[PDB]
């Protein structure tokens, strides 16, 4: 299964493993694994529960499939730096504290 | 039953109830409970429904997860404050006052 | 039941009949089958993110708009819904702005 | 049918065959090509339309801050609103 | 005729025509790949970078709204690999 959904908070997002598996520190890498104590957290439609704020994981799932931090203005850089902190991405949480401090 | 569905105002939100038990004095609070009258206020897709603005409950049950306030920049503190005094999130409410009085 | 679903402008709103019971001279109010859909919802055409506002002020009697909604979007729904009260918010917010 | 379902691009408009009759010079009212819920499928982009819509359903031009006026200005000028067009073009030349 | 996309997870629907304004573009292939079971092709990139993209196919204009990061529209544009609109994207910020 190269495709992964998953269900943050209660909307849709559609990923690869080539993206999951980028960040091998980051709670997203067991989903990249195929984590079996996980398989309970799936719902009816096979994604992944997650209980986060979907509107700041965008930009924390762009970073893997980009490298690059990239947030739209009406979106609260602090939000993007707490799920990057939960998904424990430790590259992106130093972009998005060093944006933060460039205010 | 560790995750649990509400649907706020028309839009569903997905979070487990450990997150919505985090406040005991809250409104939310019942729901983690599972409490007997809100049988007649469930869907048929099972969710919890709740007559308030889904979108002031994004900063809400944000809060829940992390404990941190975040609004973004075009949204009304005012909206968030109604939020949390309807659900009776005290350190919320105090948060937001908090951020409107330095304005 | 107590509860009520909207389908404005095609965004589903759920709410309860007490609030759309709020003002009795309202649009809103006769909803305290033609115009519903396969869901059951009450069909609207209007423009829903102009609602939020409206509903919301059913909701708890405060009128809150975010800083990028426009507010004359608002206005609109104010008076195509007939909430005098909540007509005269909007254009107070509008006189000083 | 009074109500009239549109698909555009992806995203779901409900509104009447009064309001979308309003202009006969315009592309939707060159019907008043569905998927399997009955909507009429516009390749176009949903997030202009919304004023677009709104103009034709209370004659008033609003666009939110957020939307470019440049998007909304391809949108009236695909669906043929003169009117709408002339308004648009307005907001953009007194930026 | 129509096509749908699965971009990250949100759907959009297009057409044939569209998809093949750029015959060099990555997305020339859909216009003549895995699909989930709505029959729309799977895309790993974010939906909200793409709606400017697809806009571009439509109808020739890079749009931006103010809020929209216009990296990301970059980004998009050099992976669908559509060089006008990465060229029209660069130039934007250039001009900022």
Redesign the interface.
């Known amino acids: 299964s ?2 992964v ?3 943050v ?8 493993r ?2 999951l598996c980028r960040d091998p520190k980051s709670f997203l890498y067991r989903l990249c694994q195929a984590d079996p104590d996980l398989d309970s ?1 799936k ?1 009816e439609t096979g994604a992944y ?1 997650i ?3 979907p ?2 994981f ?1 930009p924390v ?2 970073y893997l ?2 490298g ?1 931090l ?7 850089e ?2 993007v730096l ?1 799920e990057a902190e ?1 998904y424990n991405i430790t590259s992106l949480i130093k972009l998005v504290k060093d944006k933060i401090r460039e205010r």
């Open positions: 190269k495709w959904r998953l269900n908070g209660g909307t849709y997002f559609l990923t690869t080539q993206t957290d719902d529960l209980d986060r704020d509107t700041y965008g799932l762009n499939r980009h690059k990239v947030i739209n203005k009406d979106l609260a602090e939000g707490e939960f």
